[PDB]
Design a protein around this ligand. Structure first.
Ligand code: BCB
Ligand code: BCB
Ligand code: BCB
Ligand SMILES: C/C=C1/c2cc3[nH]c4c(c3C)C(=O)[C@H](C(=O)OC)c4c3nc(cc4[nH]c(cc(n2)[C@@H]1C)c(C(C)=O)c4C)[C@@H](C)[C@@H]3CCC(=O)OC/C=C(\C)CCC[C@H](C)CCC[C@@H](C)CCCC(C)C
Ligand SMILES: C/C=C1/c2cc3[nH]c4c(c3C)C(=O)[C@H](C(=O)OC)c4c3nc(cc4[nH]c(cc(n2)[C@@H]1C)c(C(C)=O)c4C)[C@@H](C)[C@@H]3CCC(=O)OC/C=C(\C)CCC[C@H](C)CCC[C@H](C)CCCC(C)C
Ligand SMILES: CC(C)=CCC/C(C)=C/CC/C(C)=C/CC/C(C)=C/CC/C(C)=C/CC/C(C)=C/CC/C(C)=C/CC1=C(C)C(=O)c2ccccc2C1=O
Ligand code: HEM
Ligand code: HEM
Ligand code: HEM
Ligand code: HEM
Ligand SMILES: CC(C)=CCC/C(C)=C/C=C/C(C)=C/C=C/C(C)=C/C=C\C=C(C)\C=C\C=C(/C)CC/C=C(\C)CCCC(C)C
Ligand SMILES: CCCCCCCCCCCC[N+](C)(C)[O-]
Ligand SMILES: CCCCCCCCCCCC[N+](C)(C)[O-]
Ligand SMILES: CCNc1nc(Cl)nc(NC(C)C)n1
Ligand SMILES: [Fe+2]
Lengths: 323, 332, 273, 258
């Protein structure tokens, strides 16, 4: 067996390396320190970390977002500490319960939710900038920043854009552990069962696919760790027996095969599409489809089943039912 | 926090849809036992006599009963509602026509309501019917009632903790979580839905595409309405000790026909029934009750699905005394 | 027909079983004994899917559905058209999957590489069994498994979830979702990084191992390193099912109430009640 | 009227379903599936007695060449025609193209089957600042075994046959990633060293165990040309050598497992 693929049998210690940025090498704060148990299944050095304007900005905004959510959450258990700590999950900061349309809701009915929504957006924004820059600074491509954009855009879709499109702030995602979760059923119910949203389907397809691909890729590499397969950059510019054997494994099993670079492309693409497919589905929902099950029924896709218990007419439509 | 095999499973939908009840056998047994305390019907008496309308003085509802029949009723009533207290809970010890005590007139109105439920809400209660025992379970105050604000413990026979007390505001979210099966849904389905007929439970569209005219801006129902409805259903489920698929095929919650079970239409009726009792019998009783009874807005205690069902899909597992006490309806 | 480098690897050996007999290639496909059983079952299962499907009211692909039997048949054999087919197709599915798994071992053996892939592939087979075999055994009937239909299998997932009022509060589910989301993100990050290093843009130099480490130290203060991000990915991914299996197995055989109420073990600690 | 409705029977979402699928099969077939073909194409085959075509399909499936400009100088362009010149001591066991090949010599030494290496560059993998990347700790002086771990220096190496085959003289470290990758041993009964990649080693307190090969077989472990450096292609030679033992160290290993 290859114990290396399970954990680092003999760790190595050596002088801390620093690859110089095209700027801000002077904002890397902190002393590298090493964890022995971390080193067993990862790199042992923790830190330093790069400060920077985008980063500080990101932190500043996110911290404000959080103070608004926590303060309101704290208002919910009427500032009792113990009940606060007890009821934390259940606690939340909600969007307008009332139909204000696109009108700015009062602070008591969603005003605060908007606020936090704003600061979170700027927080995410600044962080995007930082993710984009560090790449630029280090002379790297921006593939990560681009994958992140899609993720950020999704959030924008469910937090802002979909409520704007239909014209109600009441539709946004509450802040809070259980509350953000309850929204998922509120939203799917009103829009007639998200299982029947084609883009919900694509998204899940890509999400499962990421699981499939990252299990397959991770295992493939560990399986050719003996031939230095982990050194993927140099297996790119100079194919070695590692990625030859990785490729032939996959060719012989499924009939076609990637390369060591392209499989990260398949990977990046699948990751990206989870967020892309999902935004599309949100953009369409409420704008152009009210009830996805019925849309599907409209277009011939929906399954149908025999009555098992007797079919039950709507009472409300009977002869002289109340209302 | 776990429950051991086996589970009791039923099927309520076509095979492969995973629709049905999931019951823990011990819980079912313990409710079966609590409900088993329904006192049996008093021996039947032969109706020798005049109408107690002739015989007695202040008899308005049961006036047509012969004397022996009537005291049989008064005995059942006593045994269902105020057993520990005896007849005197309602009667003046020395004058039985006396309306001096509020339980009298309240009990009078409850005979009327009871006869209403059994006569007019047949599409819900069917031929099982209710009696006073169905709600009261042997105490004057029914154990499961609802105020215009959430309260805890649900069984009012338990002593509230500080945090449970309706006065302790820090305990609000929990009072509410425990009425909607522990969800964090920030709505009270009782006051929104069951107290009166002001709100509409259905929130799902019946067309594939958004209709022009109701689909933008202030034309729209806020998403909060979907949360609310979900809250109500969480509550109903728990009240009946059952899950959504007792009533819905979740493929389309909004659809009836093959997508809904016979029990959903019965539940539809029960919502209508509950609203009637609340609006027309129970709410008005704040007039006739001591302050001691009323909540923080001077509302009388009222009824939801639990008040009868108390955790079972049919109250008292379907026990009936309907042929045993015809006084209580159905009234021809 | 052979990759430019393939021929030197095409040596006999490595079989789990069969030896020389099926040790050969059809096109790019290694066969082997398990190639032969995989194909046998596929053809079986797909034939049953056809006959079953043809006995039913539809050939719309989204709407075709082959379902397990009524709860009443218990763990017994059910009539062909009434769960019988579904029973047979399930056996063929399991045979196909395990063949596919063992065939991957033989390929790994011949190439002299680790067996990590077939191993990783055991997780989804396992979850398949939790859903269709184990949990039905615990609960007492095959009628609890999911239907074989593109859309109908979602209707089963839907109703199963709502049997416990709100499946989102299922602690096994919460762990599962989190792994699903981390892994999706990490696959994005690992892909984006390797690509950003090998493809810097314009005519700039392909970068190095030291840059990869530097990028994430800069951004988040830690870089898990090159071998270890693969070991992580295999862990995050695999744990989507390994932790999810508990949420699934618990539902019905070990918890019959709504999942929100489960959390009452916390909410109701009487210390703060 | 309805939002989204386009005609007697058309609507927006429905058209966007179509576009969605198109974007996907486009990217997958015309992009990624071609990116997959930058190594090992065009497919090598037997030859024809008479043939004259720029066979169209071999053009269509390929992407346009890309060139990496290498960090320490040079470029690499992929795809490119990279035939395997080296002779392979293998022979077809039956007739059909499906048939497996068999070694005709010592596959460990011949380097066929699981023993094969890539024709990697005969250059020394560098760190980012130009230094040789994988070097023994004799050279790698600012490097050290972490407090807590077995220092294999001194320990005996024990082969698949149970026999001590050498003694660990050093560890080679990756200075770009801070990670040991080989042990070095003095081979018993030889005046050669062998490197053994750390993945083929079970590191005990008292011995280093190596199951891939019998003690006999350490002798013919590949030899470096420099002794404090190792080239990319040598790393491949060394690694493939042990990997080959997994099928070939003894006669029964190629045969049916069970
Ligand atoms: C517990 C929850 C479950 C679940 C929940 C789930 C949801 C909620 C959704 C899906 C979706 C999908 N599911 Mg289901 N599912 C599927 C297969 C599928 C696909 C029809 C589709 C896309 C999945 C995907 O891209 O994965 C990633 C794999 C990739 C990218 C590689 C390609 C795989 C290829 C698409 C497989 C297609 C399968 C063929 C239709 C099967 C035909 C087999 C024979 C006849 C040839 C299989 C094969 C199984 C088995 C064998 O167990 C399974 C189990 C389950 N699914 C569980 C029961 N699934 C999505 C959908 O759109 O359904 C309509 C979706 O919305
Ligand atoms: C009853 C309700 C249902 C529901 C309702 C639902 C909704 C309403 C939505 C989804 C969506 C999605 N669902 Mg579905 N769902 C899914 C899977 C999925 C995902 C693939 C996708 C969501 C995308 C995402 O990853 O968000 C997780 C990733 C996120 C949220 C991005 C985060 C990015 C961000 C940059 C991070 C920022 C963090 C910072 C720290 C912020 C700092 C905070 C401070 C400052 C406050 C599965 C696999 C199943 C199965 C098996 O049953 C299922 C069932 C159902 N879903 C039910 C049918 N689902 C979405 C969709 O695709 O619909 C089109 C969607 O909107
Ligand atoms: C209303 C109901 C809901 C629900 C009900 C639900 C149930 C009932 C279950 C899950 C489960 C799961 N849910 Mg949940 N869910 C999830 C996410 C997830 C998954 C992480 C997890 C595992 C899925 C699975 O078992 O795949 C299974 C996939 C398998 C077995 C694939 C097998 C593949 C096979 C080995 C090979 C097949 C090959 C093809 C046949 C051949 C290919 C042919 C061609 C390509 C050649 C999200 C992200 C969301 C969102 C965002 O809301 C959500 C919402 C909901 N889920 C709803 C609340 N969910 C499961 C779980 O783990 O819960 C803890 C579970 O049991
Ligand atoms: C946590 C880790 C995960 C993970 C991991 C890995 N995944 C792997 C590997 C690894 C490591 C491989 O090595 C192996 C592979 O080769 O990679 C290409 C594989 C594979 N993952 C596939 C599908 C896939 N992975 C899913 C999930 C995860 N994967 C999770 C995320 C899902 C989900 C999420 O829905 C799907 C649908 C196949 C493409 C492939 C098997 C082919 C096969 O087995 O051939 C044999 C079988 C066939 C070609 C057809 C057999 C048809 C049967 C007989 C008849 C139909 C049966 C019936 C059940 C249909 C119901 C349909 C209905 C529900 C609509
Ligand atoms: C399909 C692909 C997807 C995908 C992709 C990608 N995801 C990325 C990237 C990519 C590619 C990045 O490049 C970027 C990154 O950087 O990674 C290293 C990132 C990220 N994904 C995060 C979270 C995440 N991804 C999720 C999902 C998906 N991601 C989907 C699945 C989810 C889900 C599942 O919900 C989660 C939760 C963050 C870790 C990170 C952003 C941090 C941020 O945006 O900063 C915003 C900044 C703040 C909130 C600052 C405030 C924090 C402090 C501690 C508050 C202190 C309060 C206190 C009171 C004050 C004290 C003051 C003191 C002085 C006394
Ligand atoms: C024809 C016949 C009757 C033959 C007898 C022989 C026989 C048994 C034949 C089998 C025929 C069958 C049944 C074929 C079906 C094959 C299957 C199951 C195909 C599914 C393929 C799918 C859908 C994969 C999904 C994942 C995916 C999107 C992959 C594309 C990217 C690839 C190719 C990834 C695999 C892969 C990974 C994961 C690496 O990390 C890696 C690293 C370095 C180099 C290469 C690779 C590599 O190729
Ligand atoms: C306890 C067994 C008990 C007795 C005894 C009893 C008797 C009784 C009689 C004879 C009357 C008629 C008096 C008259 O002339 O008007 C009567 C009427 C009513 N009762 Fe009674 N009653 C007993 C118990 C109870 C209990 C416990 C209650 C209250 C829950 C109650 C109530 C009433 C009401 C109301 C009437 C009026 C009936 C009507 O037809 O309007 N009684 N009771
Ligand atoms: C059956 C004919 C019947 C009788 C009799 C009865 C009596 C009754 C009394 C005495 C009260 C007043 C209690 C008090 O001391 O304040 C009272 C109050 C409530 N009831 Fe009742 N009741 C009868 C039937 C029913 C049925 C079928 C139900 C439930 C649907 C029911 C419910 C209630 C509720 C609610 C109250 C209000 C709260 C309170 O005042 O205790 N009763 N009932
Ligand atoms: C289980 C927690 C559960 C869910 C979820 C659920 C949802 C639900 C929705 C979304 C509606 C609205 C339908 C529409 O918009 O047209 C709805 C309506 C009704 N339900 Fe329900 N339901 C859940 C559980 C239950 C249970 C256990 C039953 C039957 C005992 C039940 C019944 C009903 C009825 C009746 C309606 C119609 C409401 C009315 O017309 O007033 N549901 N449900
Ligand atoms: C509250 C709105 C409420 C709901 C919900 C509800 C539902 C319900 C169902 C689904 C049934 C039938 C179950 C089955 O057929 O298996 C049912 C039956 C009865 N109910 Fe009910 N019910 C609600 C409220 C109330 C209230 C407040 C009472 C008591 C006054 C009540 C009573 C009954 C009775 C009696 C039956 C039994 C009918 C039978 O066939 O045995 N319900 N309810
Ligand atoms: C002002 C006007 C007119 C318009 C503004 C438009 C605008 C941009 C609005 C945007 C709204 C948005 C983007 C809404 C999005 C909502 C979303 C997606 C919320 C989702 C979930 C939130 C959840 C789960 C979390 C909530 C918060 C908490 C759990 C508390 C957080 C606490 C911490 C992180 C701990 C801090 C301390 C720790 C570091 C030790
Ligand atoms: C349902 C989610 C999206 C699924 C996308 C499927 C991609 C599979 C790619 C395999 C194509 C193989 N080949 C040889 C035909 O190119
Ligand atoms: C996950 C939900 C998938 C829903 C698919 C809806 C397809 C709409 C476009 C028409 C497809 C027609 N068909 C094949 C069903 O007849
Ligand atoms: C060398 C690759 N290193 C690396 N790679 C990734 Cl994807 N993440 C991290 N660190 C954090 C974001 C977990 N380091
Ligand atoms: Fe990789």
């Amino acid at each position: 067996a290859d114990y290396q693929t399970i954990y680092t049998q003999i760790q190595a210690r050596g002088p801390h390396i620093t690859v110089s940025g095209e700027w801000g090498d002077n904002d890397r704060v902190g002393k590298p320190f090493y964890s022995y148990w971390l080193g067993k299944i990862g790199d042992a050095q923790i830190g330093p970390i790069y400060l920077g304007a985008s980063g500080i900005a990101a932190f500043a905004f996110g911290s404000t977002a959080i103070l608004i959510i926590l303060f309101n959450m704290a208002a919910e258990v009427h500032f009792d500490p113990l009940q606060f700590f007890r009821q934390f999950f259940w606690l939340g900061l909600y969007p307008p319960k009332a139909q204000y349309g696109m009108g700015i809701p009062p602070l008591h009915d969603g005003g605060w939710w908007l606020m936090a929504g704003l600061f979170m957006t700027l927080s995410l924004g600044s962080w995007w900038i930082r993710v984009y820059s560090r790449a630029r600074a280090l002379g790297l491509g921006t593939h990560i920043a681009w994958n992140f954009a899609a993720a950020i855009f999704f959030v924008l879709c469910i937090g802002c854009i979909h409520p704007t499109l239909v014209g109600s702030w009441s539709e946004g995602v509450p802040f809070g552990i259980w509350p953000h979760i309850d929204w998922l059923t509120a939203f799917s119910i009103r829009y007639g069962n998200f299982y029947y949203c084609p883009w919900h389907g694509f998204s899940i397809g890509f999400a499962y696919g990421c699981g499939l691909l990252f299990a397959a890729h991770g295992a493939t590499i560990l399986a050719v760790a003996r031939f230095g397969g982990d050194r993927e950059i140099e297996q790119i510019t100079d194919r070695g027996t590692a990625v030859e054997r990785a490729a032939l494994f996959w060719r012989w099993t499924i009939g076609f095969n990637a390369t060591i670079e392209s499989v990260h492309r398949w990977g990046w693409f699948f990751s990206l599409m989870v967020m892309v497919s999902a935004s599309v589905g949100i953009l369409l929902t409420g704008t152009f489809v009210d009830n996805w099950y019925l849309w599907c029924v409209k277009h011939g896709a929906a399954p149908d089943y025999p009555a098992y218990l007797p079919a039950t007419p709507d009472p409300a439509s009977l002869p002289g039912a109340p209302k | 926090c776990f429950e051991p095999p086996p589970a009791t499973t039923t099927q309520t939908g076509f095979r492969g849809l995973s629709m049905g009840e999931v019951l823990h056998p011990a819980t079912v047994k313990a409710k079966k036992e609590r409900d088993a305390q329904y006192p049996p019907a008093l021996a039947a008496v032969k109706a020798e006599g005049p109408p107690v309308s002739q015989v007695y003085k202040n008899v308005k509802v049961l006036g047509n009963l012969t004397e022996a029949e009537f005291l049989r009723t008064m005995t059942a009533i006593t045994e269902w509602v105020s057993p520990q207290e005896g007849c005197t809970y309602c009667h003046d010890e020395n004058n039985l026509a006396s309306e001096a005590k509020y339980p009298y007139v309240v009990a009078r109105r409850m005979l009327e309501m009871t006869r209403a439920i059994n006569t007019n809400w047949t599409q819900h209660v069917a031929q099982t019917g209710v009696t006073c025992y169905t709600c009261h379970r042997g105490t004057p105050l029914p154990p499961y009632v609802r105020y215009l604000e959430p309260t805890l413990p649900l069984n009012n026979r338990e002593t509230p903790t500080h945090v449970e007390r309706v006065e302790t505001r820090s305990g609000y979210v929990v009072r509410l979580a425990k009425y909607t099966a522990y969800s964090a849904l920030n709505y009270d389905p009782f006051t929104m839905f069951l107290a009166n007929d002001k709100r509409q439970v259905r929130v799902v569209p019946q067309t594939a595409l958004p209709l022009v005219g109701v689909s933008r801006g202030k034309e729209r129902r806020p998403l909060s309405d979907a949360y609310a409805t979900f809250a109500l259903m969480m509550s109903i489920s728990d009240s009946l000790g059952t899950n959504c698929t007792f009533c819905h095929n979740a493929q389309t919650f909004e659809s009836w026909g093959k997508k809904s079970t016979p029990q959903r239409a019965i539940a539809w009726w029960g919502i209508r029934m509950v609203r009637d009792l609340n609006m027309n019998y129970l709410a008005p009783l704040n007039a006739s009750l001591p302050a001691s009874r009323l909540g923080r807005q001077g509302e009388a205690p009222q009824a939801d699905c639990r008040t009868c069902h108390q955790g079972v899909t049919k109250p008292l597992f379907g026990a009936s005394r309907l042929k045993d006490y015809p006084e209580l309806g159905p009234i021809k | 027909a052979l990759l430019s480098f393939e021929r030197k690897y095409r040596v006999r050996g490595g079989t789990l079983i069969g030896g020389d007999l099926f040790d050969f290639w059809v096109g790019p496909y290694f066969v082997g004994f398990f190639g032969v059983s995989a194909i046998f079952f596929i053809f079986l299962g797909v034939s049953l899917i056809g006959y079953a499907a043809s006995q039913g009211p539809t050939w719309d692909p989204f709407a075709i559905s082959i379902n397990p039997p009524d709860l009443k048949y218990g763990l017994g054999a059910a009539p062909l058209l009434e769960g019988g087919f579904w029973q047979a197709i399930t056996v063929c599915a399991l045979g196909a999957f395990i063949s596919w798994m063992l065939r991957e071992v033989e390929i790994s053996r011949k190439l002299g590489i680790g067996w990590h892939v077939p191993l990783a592939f055991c997780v989804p087979i396992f979850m398949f069994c939790v859903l269709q075999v184990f949990r039905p055994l615990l609960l007492g009937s095959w009628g609890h498994a999911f239907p074989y239909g593109i859309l109908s299998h979602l209707d089963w997932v839907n109703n199963f979830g709502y049997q416990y009022l709100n499946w989102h509060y299922n602690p096994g589910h919460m762990s599962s979702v989190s792994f699903l989301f981390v892994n999706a993100m990490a696959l994005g990050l690992h892909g984006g990084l390797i690509l950003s290093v090998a493809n810097p843009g314009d005519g700039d130099k392909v970068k190095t191992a030291e840059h990869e480490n530097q990028y994430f130290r800069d951004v988040v203060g830690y870089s898990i390193g090159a071998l270890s991000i693969h070991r992580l990915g295999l862990f995050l991914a695999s744990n989507i099912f390994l932790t999810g299996a508990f949420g699934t197995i618990a539902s019905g055989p070990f918890w019959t109430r709504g999942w929100p109420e489960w959390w009452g073990w916390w909410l109701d600690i009487p210390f703060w009640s | 009227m309805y939002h989204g409705a386009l005609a007697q029977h058309l609507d927006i979402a429905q058209l966007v379903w179509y576009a969605q699928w198109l974007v996907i099969w486009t990217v997958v077939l015309l992009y990624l599936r071609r990116e997959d073909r930058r190594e090992g194409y065009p497919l090598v085959e037997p030859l024809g007695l008479v043939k004259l075509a720029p066979e169209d399909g071999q053009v269509y499936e390929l992407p346009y060449p890309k060139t990496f400009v290498l960090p320490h100088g040079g470029t690499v362009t992929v795809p490119r025609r990279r035939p395997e010149t080296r002779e392979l001591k293998l022979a077809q066991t039956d007739g059909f193209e499906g048939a497996p090949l068999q070694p005709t010599g010592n596959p460990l030494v011949d380097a066929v089957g699981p023993a094969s290496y890539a024709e990697r560059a005969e250059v020394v993998d560098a760190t980012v600042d130009g230094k040789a990347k994988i070097v023994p700790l004799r050279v790698a002086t600012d490097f050290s075994i972490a407090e807590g771990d077995v220092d294999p220096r001194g320990l005996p190496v024990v082969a698949a046959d149970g026999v001590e085959a050498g003694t660990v003289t050093d560890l080679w470290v990756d200075r770009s990633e801070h990670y040991f990758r080989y042990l070095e041993l003095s081979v018993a009964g030889s005046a050669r060293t062998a490197l053994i990649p750390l993945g083929f080693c079970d590191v005990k307190k008292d011995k280093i165990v190596v199951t891939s090969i019998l003690s006999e077989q350490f002798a013919n472990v590949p030899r470096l040309q420099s002794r404090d450096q190792i080239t990319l292609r040598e790393e491949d030679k060394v690694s493939a050598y042990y990997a080959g033992g997994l099928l070939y160290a003894t006669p029964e290993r190629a045969e049916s497992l069970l």
